[PDB]
Structure 1
Amino acid sequence: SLIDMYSEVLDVLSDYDASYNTQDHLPRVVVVGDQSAGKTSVLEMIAQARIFPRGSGEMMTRSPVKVTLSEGPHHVALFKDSSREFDLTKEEDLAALRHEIELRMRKNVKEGCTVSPETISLNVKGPGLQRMVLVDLPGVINTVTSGMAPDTKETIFSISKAYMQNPNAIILCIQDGSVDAERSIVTDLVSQMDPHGRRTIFVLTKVDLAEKNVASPSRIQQIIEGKLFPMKALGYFAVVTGKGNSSESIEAIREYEEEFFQNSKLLKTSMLKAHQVTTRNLSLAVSDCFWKMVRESVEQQADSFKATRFNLEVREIQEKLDAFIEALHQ
């Protein structure tokens, strides 16, 4: 419940005063990537539910979506400051929840705008879920298409920058394996925010399409070894997080990914490695990295609180953080 404590420190910290005495440098896992690279698909394989706007060919995530993942006895979801439990095993609840999320996303987008920086906050609890706080972000673009507000590209870059810029955020850089590395839009921003790769994890999606279309299966190995993209990362993972145009289920997608990798030239040849491979493996590394960064960040931000009290002399913000750092040490 300490993930529960953490998240309440997070969403009472916002609020968002935003100043010298109150910086928000607490770890979140921030999911960035070109439009349709599969950011939301990765999120849904980790949350294990089909609940968010998702689809190929167009802009689907039009505002940030903050998901706190915690352990629980039933797969459930609740909005922030709400008591309604959506039962993620019931299709009627899933369908209702998809509608409720789309409606809030549409509500956030003001009249002459295409995208919003207003967050949608949701808790997902479930048996065996990794504990973590993620933020799914709008896909970065290069071309503003007809109907969109003219500023949309720069607004989307601005929303991604706002979250990657937090020095203790984990940057989960989602990279479409089915599209030439040279076509990538997000690489430059990722490289600016974390030049040395101290808090970035790299995810290559759609490797099944890569085999089904690409003329150099060694370039996949070159990517996963950090040798192709001009950026650094703590780790590199290859992943299969969907198939086709129609929404499948999480279990169908997980089966498909397992089949693909166990039949893939890349693993049987040991071109790339087994620990580098499924979303499950990515999940574990991301959770480890998130918790390590939380344990290395809270005190120094305890520290900040301490500095604030007197240096000058942040009220109940400091004591929620103090309760959490209390629990945190076993």
Structure 2
Amino acid sequence: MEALIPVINKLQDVFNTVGADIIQLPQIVVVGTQSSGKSSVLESLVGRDLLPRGTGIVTRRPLILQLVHVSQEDKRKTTGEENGVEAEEWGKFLHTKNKLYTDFDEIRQEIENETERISGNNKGVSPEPIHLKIFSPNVVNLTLVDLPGMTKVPVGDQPKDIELQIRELILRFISNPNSIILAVTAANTDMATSEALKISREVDPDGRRTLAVITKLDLMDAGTDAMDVLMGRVIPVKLGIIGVVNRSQLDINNKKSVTDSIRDEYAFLQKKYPSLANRNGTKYLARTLNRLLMHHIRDCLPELKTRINVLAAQYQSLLNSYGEPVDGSGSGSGSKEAADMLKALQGASQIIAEIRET
């Protein structure tokens, strides 16, 4: 069976700067607040540190994190220059193309060196996603689209006007009918007022395409647990409620391994939620997400294939509606967009066509 996650992965890369919203690609979108621990969720799935936290302040553009599983025998010569130790894990950024990152702290640096910046226009929000492939024998095949974290308070209850732009960005990504919403909220807070769930009901009134992750189960008050939320008694999300306890900042600084953290996570779930421990934790989360993404992709595959063809026809006609000049130094802004789109649509259709097995 041809794995379909690598296929959409390539489709995501194809519509990198030419606009992917109109394609409506099947993908998981991570929506969370700034203090929800959603960045810890990503790293728990990765297996080690990757994302720049907020020593002072956090990220300002989407990160398409593509975890690609490999055999432990599948390795890479360490670069940039000198030898000879061989790497078991490596990363690739789309903007740097075939450059190889063996030092995972250099990957973090590149994310920093690529997030925000006084580039282009307006202020610090770019809906331009960063594309990152992580090759590892410790990850399951999984792709997540990480969006900038919201404020834990409503937008009106904080001073910065740029928070509106963050809310717009998130809505832009999750209004995609074929997008699965991964809403990350800490048990540390009051669930029925979570900004993550609030903004998710605006595009998905029902819980029909939203999955809720409950983090920081070990930080709840005295004499209080997350039994009702984890039993599915309060939060109106339909793809399931999954509770985890990731590494804290203390643990990261104390260099606690993710293997040791999932061990303690496991012990915690067994202790406090014995009747539910089997359907919670990082290991359960990673693989439910893998299967759900696989099932969701092939459901959308037929309708996605024709949409690329239909779009190509509409774009072709749009250029016939356009006219001149076809010549030399200037295309103009709009006609070049249609031309570049058709090129991407061509590359997209080719990728789909290469899917074998009748």
Kindly indicate whether residue 94 of structure 2 is the aligned counterpart of residue 80 of structure 1: yes
Cα deviation, residue 46, structure 1? 1.1
For 2:273, the equivalent position in structure 1 comes to 267
Q: Please tell me whether the aligned partners of residues 208 and 260 of structure 1 are also in contact (alpha carbons under 8 angstroms).
A: no
Q: Structure 2: how far apart are the matches of 1:296 and 1:260?
A: 33
Going from structure 1 to structure 2, the CA distance change for 1:241 and 1:248 (only over 3 Å counts) comes to: farther
One of 275, 278, 281 as aligned partner of 1:278: 281
One of 216, 228, 233 as aligned partner of 1:227: 233
Q: Which amino acid aligns with 2:89?
A: H
Q: Please tell me whether the aligned partners of residues 66 and 122 of structure 1 are also in contact (alpha carbons under 8 angstroms).
A: yes
Cα deviation, residue 319, structure 1? 5.2
For 2:146, the equivalent position in structure 1 comes to 136
Going from structure 1 to structure 2, the CA distance change for 1:100 and 1:14 (only over 3 Å counts) comes to: closer
For the residue of structure 2 that corresponds to 1:138, the secondary structure is coil
Cα deviation, residue 237, structure 1? 0.6
Kindly indicate whether residue 211 of structure 2 is the aligned counterpart of residue 174 of structure 1: no
Kindly indicate whether residue 245 of structure 2 is the aligned counterpart of residue 240 of structure 1: yes
For the residue of structure 2 that corresponds to 1:237, the secondary structure is strand
1:35-46 aligned at under 5 Å gives the runs: 35-46=34-45
Q: Structure 2: how far apart are the matches of 1:13 and 1:177?
A: 37
Q: Which amino acid aligns with 2:126?
A: S
Q: Please tell me whether the aligned partners of residues 69 and 125 of structure 1 are also in contact (alpha carbons under 8 angstroms).
A: yes
For 1:197, the equivalent position in structure 2 comes to 207
- Sequence identity percentage: 26
Kindly indicate whether residue 308 of structure 2 is the aligned counterpart of residue 302 of structure 1: no
For 1:216, the equivalent position in structure 2 comes to 224
Q: Structure 2: how far apart are the matches of 1:322 and 1:62?
A: 33
Q: Structure 2: how far apart are the matches of 1:260 and 1:131?
A: 22
- CA offsets, 1:282-307, max 9 Å, x none? 11111111111111112202122333
Q: Please tell me whether the aligned partners of residues 6 and 324 of structure 1 are also in contact (alpha carbons under 8 angstroms).
A: no
Q: Which amino acid aligns with 1:196?
A: D
- CA offsets, 1:96-117, max 9 Å, x none? 2222211211436667634432
Q: Which amino acid aligns with 2:231?
A: E
Query: Please, which runs of 5 or more residues in structure 2 have no aligned partner?
Result: 75-87, 318-341
For 1:48, the equivalent position in structure 2 comes to 47
TM-score by length of 1: 0.83
For 1:29, the equivalent position in structure 2 comes to 28
Q: Structure 2: how far apart are the matches of 1:103 and 1:305?
A: 34
Q: Structure 2: how far apart are the matches of 1:279 and 1:326?
A: 34
One of 56, 60, 63 as aligned partner of 2:61: 63
Query: Please, which runs of 5 or more residues in structure 1 have no aligned partner?
Result: 88-92
Going from structure 1 to structure 2, the CA distance change for 1:257 and 1:209 (only over 3 Å counts) comes to: farther
For the residue of structure 2 that corresponds to 1:261, the secondary structure is helix
For the residue of structure 1 that corresponds to 2:131, the secondary structure is strand
For the residue of structure 2 that corresponds to 1:197, the secondary structure is coil
Q: Please tell me whether the aligned partners of residues 178 and 206 of structure 1 are also in contact (alpha carbons under 8 angstroms).
A: yes
Q: Please tell me whether the aligned partners of residues 46 and 129 of structure 1 are also in contact (alpha carbons under 8 angstroms).
A: yes
Q: Please tell me whether the aligned partners of residues 194 and 200 of structure 1 are also in contact (alpha carbons under 8 angstroms).
A: yes
Going from structure 1 to structure 2, the CA distance change for 1:263 and 1:68 (only over 3 Å counts) comes to: closer
Q: Which amino acid aligns with 2:101?
A: F
State the aligned residue count. 312
One of 11, 31, 37 as aligned partner of 2:13: 11
Q: Please tell me whether the aligned partners of residues 224 and 236 of structure 1 are also in contact (alpha carbons under 8 angstroms).
A: yes
Cα deviation, residue 190, structure 1? 1.1
For the residue of structure 2 that corresponds to 1:258, the secondary structure is helix
Q: Which amino acid aligns with 1:256?
A: S
Going from structure 1 to structure 2, the CA distance change for 1:75 and 1:149 (only over 3 Å counts) comes to: farther
Kindly indicate whether residue 170 of structure 2 is the aligned counterpart of residue 160 of structure 1: yes
TM-score by length of 2: 0.77
For 1:317, the equivalent position in structure 2 comes to 345
Q: Structure 2: how far apart are the matches of 1:79 and 1:297?
A: 27
Going from structure 1 to structure 2, the CA distance change for 1:309 and 1:83 (only over 3 Å counts) comes to: closer
Q: Please tell me whether the aligned partners of residues 64 and 144 of structure 2 are also in contact (alpha carbons under 8 angstroms).
A: yes
Going from structure 1 to structure 2, the CA distance change for 1:325 and 1:31 (only over 3 Å counts) comes to: farther
Cα deviation, residue 247, structure 1? 2.1
Cα deviation, residue 257, structure 1? 3.5
- CA offsets, 1:217-257, max 9 Å, x none? 2xx1210122223x323111111111244625886244233
- CA offsets, 1:154-195, max 9 Å, x none? 111111111111111111111111122245222211112222
For the residue of structure 1 that corresponds to 2:117, the secondary structure is helix
Q: Please tell me whether the aligned partners of residues 110 and 116 of structure 1 are also in contact (alpha carbons under 8 angstroms).
A: no
Q: Structure 2: how far apart are the matches of 1:235 and 1:109?
A: 40
